């Protein structure tokens, strides 16, 4: 196209990476999950890290 | 002829003057023309697909004696019709069947065959075929192949002054450009040289050429010079001496003869003596011996006794070498003729620069100046410089070429060899020296004689050519070896070759393109256009008359290397441009049309369009203003020889529609003729209010619009199709007839505009042939709407208007009239991954029941069911194993208890923002795959709604058809109750008594069984086409394409424009209670900014609106008087007025018309206003517009009272209101807008990249950094180009932060930099990041 | 890296790489085979051409790539281009946080802010608004706070006007000249896909709104928020750092508005008499007892701050009109009243502006600009100003100026037929008369369409400058010049025949009569010329800078 | 001459920039040239602060 220096492999977009919209999501349900883990007994907390 | 039938439903009022001579061709007559050459039977090599066979054919093996000859070929039936191929997405062609004879000549011949097999028609390639309305197809999408211009093929001799060593002198250089093979060109240089370089190629001497053709030097000199003879007779020297030679040269020593002096030395020889040796006829004069001291010797002259040369032809002679040679017993010496002002002693200074000798010597230079560096051989030379213009393979001119270089060249001949000779050479060369000699003149490439123009028809046949040629080697190839009856002309001859050269083109060429068709203007502009460096050619040519618009170019990177075709231009049989003429004999302008070329033109003295002429059409004045030779001037009463035919044929159809043109800069005129083929198609197809008279014109001759074949009464009429009753007179005798009318509905266009034809006719009237049956989109009534007049007043408001900015009132967008439709076409692919294949299936992870809702069993949105942005159109689903989770994920499914699928949601959503109604679904299947329960309620559905439609054909048809045997009957054995008794079917046994009805029966006989079987047939191979797989990629499992119709209708943001060039963008959509008003308490609907008027010179878009004002005028009154049913004589009385208008017009007029029927039909027609037509060039002026407005009771001035809707006080000052036609551009805002926060990136280096069409973010400049430079703005720019782009890490860094609340950036190195270090770092190079 | 359809396609270097590793290890494998000098010298060669091919291809033989014909794209060639670096050069890297639109006017707007349309300010600060939508428990976490603003629920707009407020947006145009193609605005939450952009910034931008299209960008990072405000905001740059003088000196329609505000007719309504102040002047006008345009003594309390430091004040009762009285409202403090007492003329009206800039300082010259803005579109609209056909008034004495300059050219052209004049002589006299005869035209229609106005006071006559529509664009500054007039009503100029030569039967007739056949072929080549130099000389003009950049 | 003051730039990465590359890296690369930035372009490439 355009003959412009725009080349195939400018359009091939990375599917390995993790998006930052989400990788923000990941952050939190770690911060979310303990949390909840906290509202239990300490043997609920341990028997549900554990499994 | 004196007015149609749809002419009755709405007239134009036409202003204007000069009447019309020739009416505007058709449009189209280019792209068919062309194209409609290439594929025809020609008995002759008449360009065409007869003459590129005729070329290369015939084909003879390798010295076997084995040739294969060309017989005839054949277009075969296409395998899908036009409108089946776009569905496709195949190609619409037809297979090319070429029948070939085979001879093998016997070895050691007397010439005579052994055997002779002729393979019938054997197919190579299918090539496309044009449509009725001239497109082509190449996949699924109609593309438009652009005519091309470029510099004929000929001799052209150029200049080169200026600029070349800055020292003036000039130079002339000739160039001789066949249409095929390679370039020779001539060039002198500023010692006066003659050199030649084939191609581009290193510069040699000219005359080394000669030598290759055989030519020794001392024919070379006798062929460029002439010969001054020196005679010795008694002793010391005589010389015969033509009297002319002494022009231009002072006597060098006593010239006498016949015992008188007739000049004597430093009396240099004007006129007068020249006279005296004239009349005198002196034949002899004595010269000294030392004049020869510079006389260049012409032949070779050698010693009689010793036989060793004396001196070599081209030799300078001297006082010592005349004593050598005299003693020999030489009486006469040839030297050269040699002056320095009237014939240039040229070639004999460039032989002394010729390194070679011979004919092998040049031969050999020659050899090794094209491929140099490889040692030359005798066979190779030899056959080189055959090869370049003398074989009849690798050169041609053909006809074009043959015929200006014989034309350039002052010969008779017009047609000649397509290959050069050496008395070609020789010419051209005689005719450089003569320009250099003073006499004659060197050409221009600019100047249209010179510019050839193609079109599709030739460019195939050259791609077909190269097709046949490397097809040709092959065939030799194999019919070297070949067993005798073995193989036969199937075998050698391929497809593939041969449908890829002409496959290559339409696929992919600069030439042919998408059709621009969002207007029918659009298309009939852009299949008449042209193709062509500095400023010189861009810039118009007084050859550009009639011919190339001025006015209509793209304006931008390139300028006028476009143009555009002119109205009246046509092909010239050779393939210049022609243009109509008006012949004027004696003192009479005669209506007999001329078609004169560019070179044709030049020497006529053609008079103006622009003329006053009467009665027997002399001319009024004594003196007309005319053009004659590349300018223009007043010429006398009686000298001109042609006339100008209109007053339109300068301009283009695009800027033919501009009304009130010559009131126009020519820029805003360029821009308005540029924009208006954007305008996209509205919801209710206006009309013009102010007009030309071409858009009647340009609807008709595109295709968009559906044109009767034939004339008769309208039998029936529908929204899907028309049937037209024939009238006898126009029906052939068999199979009696209707025309039946298949309209186009809503459907997608190339741009996604909706093109839809409307019927424009009642049930039940009559039509001529040759009328409008109905409108296609954008065209009212047989005219051409590109858009929507309306109500404007030019005022400042509140700055709401800026700059261009348009200011429109609610009244347009509740009106619904600016609103446009836009059909727009998505896909979903099922494809198939190593993982596994994607499923069409329902069933999705993680949707609810509302999303699923708008789906069937199947997966496919309904046909009918409104969507909205993020609605699911396909529920697509592919396999994704394993997906490999984290603890907190794994803890989140244990306490919900989900089971996460192994397949991942691929469905096709609709995209963001975009909302509409499905109207549409198509599924594609692999051949072999289960078609799905969707897709087969779709086969059965298609297969349903074609038997229908088959049916309808045959069920109107056979009705037709005995409705005539009916009448048929009643001649000679009329039974009229009698007859209608009886089943139908038991017609056909009734004869009749001897005569021609007998043979009648007969032939409708014919037809009707005809007519079943027929309907049979097409009902079979349309089942077919149905249930065929169709043939997908590779990979493709199955892909559903849903059509999607969205109806937007305007919003701020939209670029709107009039034809005049004023360009706008909707600011505010206001109420109409805000609205300026007049007294009468109508509001208006657009508010223009008056200071865009003057500073852009278009004073037309003024005009446009006044005229306007008064046509609305016409129209309300009449709007009145039909609302008060006054009664047909006052009406008609009325409109008789308007149609005159105070003095000498074109238009003529009525009560011809019907007075009853007819009459109170056009005024219903009129009452929303009074269509005008203005002229190019012809139109109304100031007078003719007030007094229409003295019809209209409003003001001469234009401009009438307003009031603020908001304070309801006055406005000071009168303001101009009135009608201004106005376009709608397709900009559209929601287009054009985009946001993005977070995207996609790009793999190779990291950058945002849109890939769900949620679109990458905007590009960042370098003149953007510089100005964050200019500011002290450091932040700003490292955000810019690290962590908001470039760095992996820093995104996400930063993104967590902004989250958090905390504003900051840790910034890292972009991924960019990172990269060409390692790049660096790949090469030898150690570069590493020193210190801390 | 796999595409769509199951094809793959990689870089042109593995194609390269792969081939100098063949022949390599073929080398290797011809040392262990003893092969004869001939060979392993050959496959030395090989070695090295595909080295060289491998680095920088194009310096030897220039390899072609597998298949296709396109040589392949070597080392050296990733990092060379055009020009030099692909990274940094134009262009240039894609950026985050953006977006793009067609641009409106929106009049409403102050200097320092923008119409930004919703939905661009949604997808733009979707983290702002995700962290913001949870800080104060609108949302449970980040995902809710996604479906929130996927959902579009009704809550999420009064959150999106707190991340609003006092954040700025970039606004950037095509063709990026001086720093003031990009500034600093405060975002308005606007209705509609459009940007609104005031007036008075679209000089330094060259935007026009026939379409031009602009760029947003948000300033993430606090010292970019800052840098904003305090570098590139739109009230900081009000001058053009090439000269001194405003670049937000008020355009056209708003100095259209202030040039028909203060003028003066000979009569109207309310002429001779007196009022107290300002205040009471519009209550006038509004009223409809007194015209816009009247000379009138009233009193006026105007300031000057001469002393150390310090505004003096002083009263008197200047002799003035209506409109110069209302707009007196609006000069803020030291100025005196002699700046607003004249016609207001586009160059005028600029020096008003400077003036209180080099006085009272920055912040009273931004809100006195907006002031500016408003009223002269506010008046403006109120004046009813339009543009007719008899607008435009063609001198009477016209077609006899043609007529004899027309006897000149006959007159040099018999002298040169008697050969009293030789040809050259001839064609510069003819050009001259013809040129003469159109400074002729213009400075008669310039008179009359000036002056024309002929009007009464309690006498017989008198005569002021015209009031005719047309007249005052040209004249206030607004739009148009004595040049574009001159073709309007008076002949327009000789056009130019492509070589460069000039016609020496110019165009006789203009714009308001017709233009036939011929004269519009020739005009033709001035504007083909005209749009083509301009477009070509657009690109180089940049180039200039490119150059100057780079020194500098 | 403008066009031939800018040539002669201490920082290369600067020059490889708008100059001819290839030239630029050698002829730098030869002597061993250490380029300490402190100029704009060259801040650019490497994304720092001006
Ligand atoms: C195969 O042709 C392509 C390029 C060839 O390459 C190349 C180097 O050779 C070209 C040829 C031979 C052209 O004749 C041409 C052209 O005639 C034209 C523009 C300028 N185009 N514009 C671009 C868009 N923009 C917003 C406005 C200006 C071009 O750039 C080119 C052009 C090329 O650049 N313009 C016009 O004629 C005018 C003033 C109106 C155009 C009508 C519509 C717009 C077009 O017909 C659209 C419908 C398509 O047809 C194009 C998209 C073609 O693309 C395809 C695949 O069909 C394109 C010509
Ligand atoms: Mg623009």
């Given at each position: ?19 930052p919209?989400d ?17 239990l ?8 890290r554990?499994? | 002829?004196v ?15 000069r ?30 697909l ?5 070329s ?9 004696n ?11 039936e ?21 029948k ?10 007397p010439?005579?065959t ?8 054997v ?26 211009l ?38 002198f ?5 003659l050199?030649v370089?084939?191609?581009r ?6 005359t ?11 024919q ?18 005589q ?6 030679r ?37 034949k002899?004069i ?8 510079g006389?260049?010797v ?15 032809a ?6 010592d070498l ?10 006469r010496?040839?030297?050269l003729?040699?002056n ?7 070639i ?22 094209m491929?140099?560096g490889?040692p030359?051989?005798?066979?190779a ?8 213009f ?33 008395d ?10 003569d ?54 002309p ?23 393109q998408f059709?621009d ?20 050619v ?6 550009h ?32 441009l022609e ?17 004169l070329?560019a ?22 004045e004594?003196?007309?203003?005319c053009?004659?030779?590349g ?10 020889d042609?006339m ?6 300068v ?8 009304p ?25 197809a ?16 595109s295709?968009?619009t ?5 004339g ?10 028309i ?17 039946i ?27 001529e ?6 409108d ?11 858009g ?19 200011l ?13 439709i ?9 494809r ?5 294949p994607?499923?069409?299936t ?65 469905s ?25 329960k ?6 059965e ?17 056979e ?10 009957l ?10 209608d ?81 004023n ?9 109409i ?11 208006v ?7 865009g ?22 129209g309300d ?6 609302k008060?049913?006054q ?6 009385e ?24 007819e ?16 002229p190019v ?5 100031e ?14 001035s ?26 709608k ?11 993005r926060s977070?995207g ?8 945002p990249?849109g ?20 500011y ?6 490292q ?8 760095d992996?890490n ?8 902004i ?9 890292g ?12 770092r790949?090469?030898?190079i ?7 | ?18 081939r ?6 073929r080398?290797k494998?011809?040392?262990d085979?003893?092969?004869?000098d001939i ?17 920088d ?15 392949l ?14 990274r ?7 950026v985050?946080?953006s ?13 320092h ?8 300010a ?5 983290p702002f608004?995700?962290?913001k ?20 629920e ?16 970039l606004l ?18 606007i ?5 609104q ?7 330094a ?7 031009d ?43 259209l508005?202030?040039?028909?505000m203060?003028?003066?007719?000979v ?8 009022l107290?102040?300002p ?22 309390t ?6 150390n430091?310090?505004?003096?004040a ?27 007492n ?52 063609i ?22 037929q ?26 008669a229609?310039?008179d ?26 040209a ?12 073709q309007?009503?008076?002949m ?7 070589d ?14 017709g ?15 005209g749009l083509?130099?301009?477009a ?17 | 001459?403008i ?8 920082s ?21 040239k ?7 372009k060259?801040?650019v ?6």
């Open positions: 196209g355009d003959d412009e220096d725009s080349h195939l492999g400018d359009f091939i977009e990375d599917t390995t990476l993790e998006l919209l990788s923000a999501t990941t952050e939190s349900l770690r911060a979310a999950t303990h949390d909840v883990l906290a509202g007994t300490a043997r609920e907390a341990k028997v549900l554990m499994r | 002829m007015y149609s039938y749809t002419e009755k439903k709405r007239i134009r009022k036409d202003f204007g003057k009447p019309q001579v020739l009416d505007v061709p058709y449009l189209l007559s280019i792209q068919l023309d062309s194209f409609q050459k290439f594929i025809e039977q020609d008995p002759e090599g008449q360009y065409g007869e003459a590129a066979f005729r290369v054919f015939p084909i003879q093996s390798y010295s076997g084995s040739e294969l000859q060309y017989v005839s070929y054949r277009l075969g296409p395998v899908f019709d036009v409108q089946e191929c776009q569905i496709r997405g195949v190609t619409y062609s037809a297979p090319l069947r070429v070939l004879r085979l001879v093998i000549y016997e070895r050691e011949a010439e005579g052994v055997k002779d097999i002729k393979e019938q028609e197919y190579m390639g299918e090539i496309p075929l044009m449509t009725d309305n001239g497109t082509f197809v190449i996949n699924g999408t109609e593309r438009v192949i652009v005519s091309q470029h510099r004929s093929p000929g001799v052209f001799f150029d200049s080169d002054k200026g600029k070349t060593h800055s020292s003036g002198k000039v130079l002339y250089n000739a160039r001789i450009i066949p249409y095929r093979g390679s370039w020779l060109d001539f060039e240089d500023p010692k006066d040289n050199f370089r084939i191609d190629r290193r510069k040699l001497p000219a080394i050429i000669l030598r290759a053709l055989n030519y020794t030097t001392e070379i000199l006798d062929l460029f010079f002439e010969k001054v003879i020196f005679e010795i007779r008694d002793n010391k020297l010389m015969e001496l033509v009297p002319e002494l022009r231009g040269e002072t006597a060098s020593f006593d010239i006498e003869a016949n015992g008188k002096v007739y000049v004597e030395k430093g009396r240099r020889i004007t006129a007068r003596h020249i006279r005296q040796l004239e009349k005198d006829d002196v002899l004595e010269v000294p011996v030392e004049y020869i001291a006389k260049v012409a032949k070779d002259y050698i010693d009689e006794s010793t036989g060793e040369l004396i001196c070599a081209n030799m300078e002679l001297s006082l005349l004593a050598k040679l005299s003693q020999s017993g030489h009486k010496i040839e030297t003729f040699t320095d002002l009237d014939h240039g002693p040229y004999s200074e460039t032989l002394r620069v010729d390194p070679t000798n011979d004919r092998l010597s040049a031969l050999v230079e020659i050899y090794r100046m491929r140099p490889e030359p051989t005798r066979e030379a030899e056959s080189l410089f055959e090869n370049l003398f074989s009849e393979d690798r050169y041609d001119l053909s006809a074009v070429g043959r015929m200006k270089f014989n034309r350039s060249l002052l010969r008779e001949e017009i047609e000649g060899s397509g290959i050069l000779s050496k070609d050479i020789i010419d051209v060369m005689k005719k450089l020296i320009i250099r000699n003073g006499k004659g003149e060197v050409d221009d490439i600019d100047h249209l004689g010179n510019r050839r123009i193609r079109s599709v028809g030739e460019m195939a046949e050259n791609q077909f050519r190269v097709g046949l040629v490397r097809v040709e080697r092959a065939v030799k190839e194999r019919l070297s070896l070949g067993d005798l009856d073995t193989l036969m199937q075998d050698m001859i391929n497809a593939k070759p041969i449908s890829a050269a002409v496959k290559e083109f339409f696929g992919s060429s600069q030439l042919s059709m068709q969002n207007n029918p203007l659009s298309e009939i502009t852009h299949k008449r256009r042209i193709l062509a460096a500095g400023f010189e861009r810039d118009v040519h007084p050859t008359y009639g011919r190339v618009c001025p006015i209509e170019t793209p304006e931008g990177p390139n300028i006028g290397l476009i143009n555009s075709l002119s109205v009246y231009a046509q092909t010239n049989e050779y393939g210049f243009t109509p003429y008006r012949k004027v004999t004696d003192g009479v302008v005669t209506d007999e049309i001329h078609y070329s070179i044709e033109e030049g020497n006529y003295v053609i008079a103006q369009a622009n003329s006053n002429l009467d009665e027997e059409g002399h001319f009024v004594d003196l007309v203003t053009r004659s030779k300018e223009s001037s007043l010429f006398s009463r009686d000298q001109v042609y100008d035919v209109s007053t339109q044929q301009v283009s159809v695009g800027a033919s529609l501009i009130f043109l010559e009131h126009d800069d020519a820029n805003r005129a360029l821009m308005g003729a540029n924009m208006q083929r954007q305008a996209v198609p509205t919801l209710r206006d009309k013009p209010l102010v007009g030309t008279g071409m858009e009647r014109a340009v609807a008709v001759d295709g968009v559906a044109v009767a074949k034939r008769g009464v309208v039998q029936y009429v529908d929204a899907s199709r049937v037209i009753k024939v009238n006898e007179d126009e029906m052939y005798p068999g199979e009696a007839g209707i025309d009318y298949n309209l186009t509905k809503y459907t997608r266009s190339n741009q996604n505009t909706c093109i839809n034809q409307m019927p424009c006719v009642s049930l039940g009237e009559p039509v042939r040759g009328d409008v049956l109905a296609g989109p954008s065209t009212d009534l047989g005219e051409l709407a590109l929507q007049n309306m109500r404007v007043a030019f005022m400042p408001w509140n700055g709401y208007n800026f700059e261009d900015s348009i429109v009132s609610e009244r347009v967008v509740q009106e619904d009239r600016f609103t446009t836009h059909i727009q076409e998505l896909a979903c692919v099922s198939d991954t190593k993982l596994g994607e499923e069409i329902a069933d999705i992870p993680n949707v609810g029941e509302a999303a699923l809702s708008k789906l069937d069993e199947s997966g496919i949105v309904y046909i009918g069911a409104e969507v909205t942005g993020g609605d699911i159109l396909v529920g697509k689903v592919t396999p994704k194993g394993e997906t490999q989770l984290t603890p907190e994920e794994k803890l989140l499914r244990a306490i919900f208890g989900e089971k996460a699928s192994d397949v991942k949601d691929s096709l959503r609709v995209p963001n923002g975009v909302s509409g109604t499905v109207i549409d679904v198509q599924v594609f299947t692999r051949d072999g795959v289960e078609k799905d969707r897709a087969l309620e779709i086969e559905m298609q297969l349903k709604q074609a038997k229908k439609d088959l049916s309808e054909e045959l069920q109107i048809l009705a037709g058809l005995f409705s005539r045997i009916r009448a048929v009643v001649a000679g054995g009329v039974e009229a109750e009698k007859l008794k009886l089943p139908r079917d038991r017609w056909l046994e009734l004869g009749l008594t001897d005569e021609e009805k007998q043979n009648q029966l007969e032939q409708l006989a014919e037809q009707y069984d005809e007519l079943k079987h027929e309907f049979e047939k097409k009902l079979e191979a349309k089942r077919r086409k149905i249930t065929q797989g169709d043939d997908l990629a590779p990979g493709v499992l199955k892909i559903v394409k849903v059509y999607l119709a969205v109806k937007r209708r305007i919003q701020p943001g939209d670029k709107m424009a009039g034809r005049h060039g360009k706008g963008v909707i600011s505010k959509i206001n109420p209670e805000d609205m300026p008003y007049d007294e009468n308490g109508t509001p609907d657009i508010v223009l900014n008056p200071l008027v003057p500073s852009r010179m278009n004073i037309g878009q003024i005009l446009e609106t006044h005229l306007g004002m008064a046509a609305k005028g016409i009154k009449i709007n009145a008087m039909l008060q049913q009664e047909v004589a006052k009406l008609r009325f409109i008789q007025r308007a149609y005159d208008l105070g003095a000498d017009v074109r238009q003529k007029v009525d009560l011809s018309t019907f007075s009853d029927e009459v109170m039909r056009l005024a219903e027609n009129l009452r929303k206003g009074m269509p005008i037509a203005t060039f012809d139109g109304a002026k007078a003719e517009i007030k007094e229409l407005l003295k019809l209209g009771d409003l003001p001469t234009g401009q009438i009272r307003l009031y603020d809707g908001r304070t309801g006080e006055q406005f000071e000052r009168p303001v101009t209101v009135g009608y201004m036609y106005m376009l551009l397709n900009h559209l805002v929601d287009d054009k807008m985009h946001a977070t996609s990136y790009s793999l190779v280096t990291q950058q990249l890939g769900k069409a949620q679109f990458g973010g905007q590009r960042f400049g370098e003149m953007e950094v510089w100005a964050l430079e200019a002290g703005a450091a932040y700003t720019l955000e810019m180009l690290t962590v908001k782009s470039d992996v820093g995104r996400t860094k930063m993104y967590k932060n989250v958090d609340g905390n504003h900051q950036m840790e910034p190195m972009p991924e960019s930099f990172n990269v060409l270090l390692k790049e660096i790949s090469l030898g150690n570069i590493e990041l020193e210190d801390e | 890296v796999p595409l769509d359809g199951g094809r793959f396609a990689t870089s042109d270097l593995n194609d390269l790489y792969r100098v590793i063949n022949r390599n290890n080398l494998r011809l040392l085979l003893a092969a004869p060979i392993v010298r050959n496959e030395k060669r090989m070695l090295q051409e595909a080295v060289d091919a491998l680095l291809n194009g310096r030897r033989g220039r390899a072609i790539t597998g298949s296709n014909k396109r040589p794209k070597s080392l050296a060639d990733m990092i060379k281009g055009k020009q030099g670096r692909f940094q050069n134009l262009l240039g890297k894609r985050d946080y977006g793009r639109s067609v641009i409106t006017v929106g009049p409403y707007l102050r200097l802010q923008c119409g930004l349309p919703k939905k661009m949604l997808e733009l600060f979707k608004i995700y962290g939508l949870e800080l104060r428990g609108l949302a449970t976490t980040i995902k809710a706070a996604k479906k929130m603003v996927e959902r579009e009704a809550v999420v707009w009064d959150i999106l006007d707190e991340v609003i407020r006092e954040h700025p947006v950037n145009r095509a063709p990026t000249l001086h720093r003031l193609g990009i500034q600093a605005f405060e975002p308005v939450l209705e509609g896909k459009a940007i952009l005031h007036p008075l910034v679209c000089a931008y060259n935007a026009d709104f026939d379409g299209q602009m760029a947003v960008h948000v300033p993430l990072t606090l010292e970019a928020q800052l840098e904003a405000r305090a570098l590139m905001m739109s009230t900081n740059n009000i001058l053009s750092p090439a000269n001194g003088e405003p670049i937000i000196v008020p355009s056209q329609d708003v100095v508005g202030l040039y028909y203060t003028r003066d007719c009569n109207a309504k309310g002429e001779g008499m007196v107290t102040g205040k009471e002047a519009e209550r006038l006008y509004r009223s409809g007892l007194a015209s816009l345009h009247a000379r009138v003594k009233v009193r006026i105007e300031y000057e701050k001469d002393a430091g310090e505004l003096v002083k009263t008197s009762l200047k002799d003035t009109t209506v409109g110069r009285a209302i707009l007196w409202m609006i000069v803020p403090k030291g100025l005196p009243y002699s700046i607003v004249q016609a207001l003329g586009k160059k005028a009206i600029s020096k008003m502006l400077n003036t209180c800039y080099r006085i009272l300082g920055l912040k009273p010259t931004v809100i006195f600009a907006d002031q500016i803005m408003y009223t002269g579109f506010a008046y403006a609209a109120r004046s009813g100003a339009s543009v007719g056909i008899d607008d435009m008034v001198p009477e004495k016209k077609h006899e100026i043609i007529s004899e300059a027309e006897a000149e050219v006959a007159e040099i052209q018999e002298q040169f008697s050969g009293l004049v030789t040809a050259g002589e001839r064609y510069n006299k003819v050009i001259d008369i013809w040129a003469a005869a159109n400074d002729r035209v213009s400075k229609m310039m009359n369409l000036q002056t024309e106005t002929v009007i009464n006071r309690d006498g017989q006559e008198e005569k002021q400058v015209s009031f005719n529509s047309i007249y005052m664009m004249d206030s500054g607004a739009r148009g010049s004595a040049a574009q007039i001159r309007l009503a008076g327009r100029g000789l056009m130019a025949k492509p460069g030569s000039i016609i020496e039967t110019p165009i006789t007739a203009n714009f308001r009569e233009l036939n056949v011929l004269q519009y072929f020739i005009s033709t080549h001035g504007a083909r010329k083509a130099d301009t070509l000389k657009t690109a180089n003009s940049g180039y200039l800078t490119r150059r100057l950049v780079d020194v500098a | 001459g066009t031939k003051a800018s040539l002669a730039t201490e290369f990465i600067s020059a490889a920039s708008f100059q001819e590359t290839t030239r630029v890296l050698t002829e730098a690369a030869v002597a061993g250490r380029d300490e930035l402190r100029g704009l060259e801040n490439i490497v994304g720092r602060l001006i």
